[PDB]
Structure 1
Amino acid sequence: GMRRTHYAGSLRETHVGEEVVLEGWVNRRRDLGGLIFLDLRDREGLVQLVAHPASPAYATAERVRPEWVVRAKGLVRLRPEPNPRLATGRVEVELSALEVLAEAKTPPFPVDAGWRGEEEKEASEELRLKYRYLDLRRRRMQENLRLRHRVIKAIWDFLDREGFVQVETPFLTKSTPEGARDFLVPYRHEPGLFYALPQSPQLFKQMLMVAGLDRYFQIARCFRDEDLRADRQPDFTQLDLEMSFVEVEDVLELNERLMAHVFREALGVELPLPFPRLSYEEAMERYGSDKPDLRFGLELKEVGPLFRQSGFRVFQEAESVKALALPKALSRKEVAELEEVAKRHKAQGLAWARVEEGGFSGGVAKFLEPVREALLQATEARPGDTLLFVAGPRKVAATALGAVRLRAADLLGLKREGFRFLWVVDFPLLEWAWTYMHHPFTSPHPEDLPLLEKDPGRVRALAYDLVLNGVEVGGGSIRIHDPRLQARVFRLLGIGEEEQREKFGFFLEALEYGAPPHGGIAWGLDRLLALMTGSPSIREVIAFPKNKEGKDPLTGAPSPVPEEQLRELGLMVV
């Protein structure tokens, strides 16, 4: 068997009196009172080793240095005083033997403080990525990676119990000129031909429903060679799933129970069910976003129809006037910062006013007094608040004041805690010619089918987004299984026969052989884990990620190849 008797970090008072053998890294060394203290570290935590002057390990303990790998033997003792910041804090190991297994260069940054429960100074992320195998020694990074393990295992446990079959889908597949750019892989035996890496398993998982597997899932890697700004990696991980004979309700319900199972098992957090749901229209009206942050209130209110007779022209003529009531009297500085956030979101401006005990004061207060009783019942605003207004087109006014609403939350120092999930449902199928939102296999709402040709902009889709704390962590839809309806959606989009066969030919032919009703979703697993850990970037929950620019400082990729390796592929640099 193994030489070690225990993980170093697993020792407790229950082990006092046992002789242990331990292996790990020297986290720190201190000399006090003629004793040598060594913090010995492995993935379960630190344990204090003590070398006494009479001990055979005494000279060895004096020469070891941080990050050296050692094997220690000794007997577990109570400490005279416990250190409650260590789980092993009640005990130490009186060293009888100490063996050096590997020496170590001084690391470019410290990895020792977190394991003592101390705060860690921020290091250059580029330096952290270049030495990622050392960055991953830190307690924080190992907790992230081990949480990711527990989340995926919980997903397997749940979906296996519910009858889902995990199926692995191809990585070398068909390159299509459809939409986002593919990463290409040259085919050596015939220069000029390429595989593509998959943007998602969408077509394969739908074909698995056509194959009768009923329900599928995969922890899937997706590859999209597009703009890497906004915390995007060249590849990322989805929890991808698909089910047969389901309505929207069936997919949402399954995903709610799965998410609650994951949070209970991997985080010890209880998620109340069911999740709240908002239509896309309700979300835009009340929050100005299709990914609302429900950790605070401050909803937007439509007040347009209050000023239809007011002398204030810019309110009276606007298609929409949105109002927001902040529970604080803001400075002229803060208002202008909010106004700047509004104008940077295409608004014409941000009107404002303070709410006093008898009326209003400041900004547009004069034009608000005639409609005071109605304005206050609509906004539920109390004396001391500050009213913010954005007038303009309905989508612009909502989106602008919604961004004002988010930035306002920071200015007021609102406590934003916990995990607030919600479903956003009833997205529009299209948008102005006409174009779809995600992919063209999303089913129209059955009761909206006749509007497909008459009023396409009002057709709802059977599509849904999963949002957590203002972040889109999942998206999917019920699919079209009728090839006649799919052709009908293509005719509405102006997508001809030759273009369909070039982009989707093999799948459109699959629908002719009896596809069941089906639908599904994919989570952004990296985004979920970053939110679960309070990380500012998904790079903190990926073992070996790229930097923000898409390169890998650890290995040096992407790198040149010898021209003989490229000539063998029949390609050359132009």
Structure 2
Amino acid sequence: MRSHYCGQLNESLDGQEVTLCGWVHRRRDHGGVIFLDVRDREGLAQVVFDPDRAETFAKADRVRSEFVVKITGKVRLRPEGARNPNMASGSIEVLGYELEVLNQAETPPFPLDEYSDVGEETRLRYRFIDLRRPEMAAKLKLRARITSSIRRYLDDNGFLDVETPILGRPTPEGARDYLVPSRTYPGHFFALPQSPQLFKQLLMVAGFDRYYQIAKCFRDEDLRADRQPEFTQIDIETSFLDESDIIGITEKMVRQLFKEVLDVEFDEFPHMPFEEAMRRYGSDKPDLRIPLELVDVADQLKEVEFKVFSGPANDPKGRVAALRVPGAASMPRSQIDDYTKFVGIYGAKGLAYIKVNERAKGVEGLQSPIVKFIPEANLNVILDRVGAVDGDIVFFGADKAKIVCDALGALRIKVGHDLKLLTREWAPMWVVDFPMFEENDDGSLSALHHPFTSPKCTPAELEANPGAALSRAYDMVLNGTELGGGSIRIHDKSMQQAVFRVLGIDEAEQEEKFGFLLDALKYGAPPHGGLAFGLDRLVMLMTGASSIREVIAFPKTQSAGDVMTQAPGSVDGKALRELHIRLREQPKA
């Protein structure tokens, strides 16, 4: 029977007695006065003991670290010189009337709060006492608040929380499936889903107008930092809706969520085309906090003596883009070399530059080794175009389109953060209008997303010139990171056959790879479209956490194993035999 939470002791409850249960954080013994810091889910509070009731003192001297205790006392208003900023309840104390030790505790491996030098492996191995730390708990509770808000919104807007099975059928092409040996069907396997995509589409076929699900997803790929094998995703699919409606509902959701939890507001989300994003940022996930923008200038540098510019300037398969960084002419050559080496890692042969100091003197007003091979007029209209003035530096990326886009895009974000050139507000956005196809190294055409993505044009303008086709696909970006995305699917016979014809796939593969899907599609599928969010990263952003493991209760390391439960582990030969499988760890000479 608890009266109040430790970390919810405001100043208003003065003159009231309270009973609070929790753990013993740290204990201070002064002899004449004993201090206890009791901690629960809401935070820490201080309880003070004077030996005027020396029995409680006897029940105060034995108490050690992390003891689970229940204390009843009165909240006394602490002196002005004793107030604590770090403690949220740190302007009041509680004098302990009676104490009881609910349970004893062995010494906690590691200490809570810094600079206790825990290392990540030890923190993961004893994760059950690590989550006692108020910061981790705040992160997880925040996650709970997020899922709460999202569920409330989606429920209120007529979506149905329906569960889809995890054990499904394995198939290649997309990614490595986690397999599950079948006890009842020897030689056959179940497979963990990569996304409830197919199932949600079936649910659209099934007549359910609006579907949502917070589902578990599994990928057997080698992983990146901020990447885990088991990750949670917010799946959403709707019927009889176009892209505007879907983006509307979803955007509204994100705003309402950010205002419910963090209490921030987002105005409106600008819709930016893929083409524009690639043009002025060189990335499909632009960081709209950094105002710095890439500006194309290769057209006026075609017939020029300097050859690393003119080369790609006359080559259609690439461009020459410039990047103005303001007030950064004072930058030292060391940093310049560092940046050249940085853009080096994305394939750029070189990072050309111009330090712009005095515009009215022309060429002797532009200190740089490149200025000699380029005419004064072109220079001046370039400087005019990029928006540069006195005191600035202009960088130059001149190569194949992909390379310059990536290298200058990254140089953009890097020098963006390094010089603190951003507004510290939240900056959300939508990326729309992707291309339909791309070349696949060897040749030919292929769909980037899925062959089921709706093109903006008709199957005739499509079979005309497939390269001019834009897709009805959409990704949502926040702080330059991709929160998620989806698209409206094709339900048209002649259209599905059009994209099928244009990709080189005959009916053999159509049947072998997508037969059951096409089957389900043939029996009367409605206009439907969807999107999915990576819930983990969303919570990671909303918390301000460094890694994704910080927003997952019991995460796994980069090699897919978790050190706490020592999984994966070994299994006895019996269970191995009953599942119709064999090992192959045989002794060699």
Q: When the two structures are superposed, what TM-score results if normalisation uses the length of structure 2?
A: 0.92
Residue type of the alignment partner of 2:197? Q
Query: Equivalent residue for 2:8?
Result: 10
Counterpart CA distance in 2 for 1:554 and 1:144 is 20
- Candidates 554, 558, 563, aligned match of 2:573: 563
Aligned length: 564
Q: Tell me, in whole angstroms, the C-alpha distance in 2 between the residues paired with 1:143 and 1:88.
A: 15
How far the C-alpha of 1:54 sits from its partner, in A, is 2.1
**Aligned counterpart, 1:116:** none
**What's the offset of the Cα at 1:267?**
1.1
Query: What is the distance in 1 between the residues matched to 2:487 and 2:156?
Result: 23
Q: What amino acid is the match of 1:564?
A: K
Q: Which residue of 1 aligns with 2:62?
A: 63
CA distance in 2, matches of 1:317, 1:91: 73
User: Secondary structure of 1:73's match?
Assistant: strand
Task: Please say which of residues 237-246 and 502-511 is displaced more in the overlay.
Answer: 502-511
Structure 1, residues 138-187: CA drift from partner, whole Å, max 9, x if none?
Answer: 11111111111111111111111211111111101111123201001111
Paired residue secondary structure (1:221): strand
- Aligned-residue CA RMSD (Å): 1.7
The more displaced of 309-318 and 22-31 is 309-318
Q: CA deviation at 1:216?
A: 0.7
Give the Cα separation in 2 of the matches to 1:419 and 1:120.
30
Is 2:557 the partner of 1:547? yes
Amino acid at match of 1:430: F
Instruction: For residue 462 of structure 1, give the secondary structure of its aligned residue in structure 2.
Output: strand
* Match of residue 177, structure 2, among 174, 178, 182: 182
Matched residue SS, 1:402? helix
2:587 equivalent in structure 1:
none
| Pair 1:157-2:152 in alignment | yes
Give the superposition deviation at 1:306. Answer: 2.0
**Partners in 2 of 1:192 and 1:496 — Cα distance?**
30
Does residue 247 (structure 1) correspond to residue 242 (structure 2)? The answer is yes
1:378 counterpart = 2:385: yes
SS of 1:511's partner is helix
Equivalents in 2 of 1:120, 1:464: separation in Å? 44
Question: What does residue 273 of structure 2 align with?
Answer: 279
Greater mean deviation of Cα atoms: 125-134 or 193-202:
125-134
Which one of the candidate residues 471, 483, 488 is aligned to 2:498?
488
SS of the residue 1:472 aligns to: strand
1:451 CA drift (Å): 4.2
Alignment gaps of 5+ in structure 2 = 314-318, 360-364, 585-589
Quote the residue 1:323 is aligned against.
Answer: 322
| 1:298 alignment partner in structure 2 | 292
Q: Which amino acid aligns with 1:472?
A: E
Q: Does residue 52 in structure 1 map to residue 50 in structure 2? A: yes
Aligned to 1:354: 355
SS in 2 for 1:146: helix
- Once the two structures are TM-superposed, the CA of residue 365 in structure 1 deviates from its matched residue by 2.5
Letter in 2 for 1:29: R
Q: Which residue of 2 aligns with 1:470?
A: 480
Deviations 1:331-384 (A, max 9, x none): 222222222222221222111110011321023132353423201111111111
| Secondary structure at 1:528 match in 2 | helix
Aligned to 2:74: 75
1:400 has 2:407 as partner: yes
Structure-to-structure mapping, 1:62-211, within 5 angstroms: 62-81=61-80, 82-111=83-112, 113=113, 120-121=115-116, 123-211=118-206
Give CA deviations for 1:481-534 in whole Å, capped at 9, x if unaligned.
113322332232223323233332222111111111110100111111111122
Structure 1: unaligned runs, 5 residues or longer: 114-118
User: In 1, Cα distance between the equivalents of 2:485 and 2:118?
Assistant: 35
Task: Give the deviation of 1:474 after TM superposition.
Answer: 0.8
Q: Is the 8 A contact 1:483 1:508 kept in 2?
A: no
Residue 22 of structure 1 pairs with residue 20 of structure 2: yes
Question: Higher mean Cα deviation, 540-549 or 75-84?
Answer: 75-84
Task: Give CA deviations for 1:401-432 in whole Å, capped at 9, x if unaligned.
Answer: 11111221233233452321111111112211
Instruction: Give me the whole-angstrom Cα distance separating, in 1, the residues matched to 2:165 and 2:122.
Output: 34
Q: State the 1:229 CA deviation.
A: 1.6
After the TM superposition, which of the residue ranges 341-350 and 136-145 deviates more from structure 2?
341-350
Of 335-344 and 468-477, more deviation after overlay is shown by: 335-344
2:292 is the counterpart of 1:312 = no
Q: Amino acid of the residue matched to residue 495 of structure 2?
A: L
Amino acid at match of 2:336: V
Amino acid at match of 2:139: N
Look up the SS of the partner of 2:74 in the other structure. Answer: strand
Q: Given the alignment of the two structures, is residue 226 of structure 1 paired with residue 226 of structure 2, yes or no? A: no
Q: CA deviation at 1:190?
A: 1.9
TM-score in terms of structure 1 length: 0.95
Question: Within 2, Cα distance between the matches of 1:483 and 1:345?
Answer: 42
Compute the displacement of 1:22 (Å).
1.3
Does the residue aligned with 2:138 lie in a helix, a strand or coil? Answer: helix
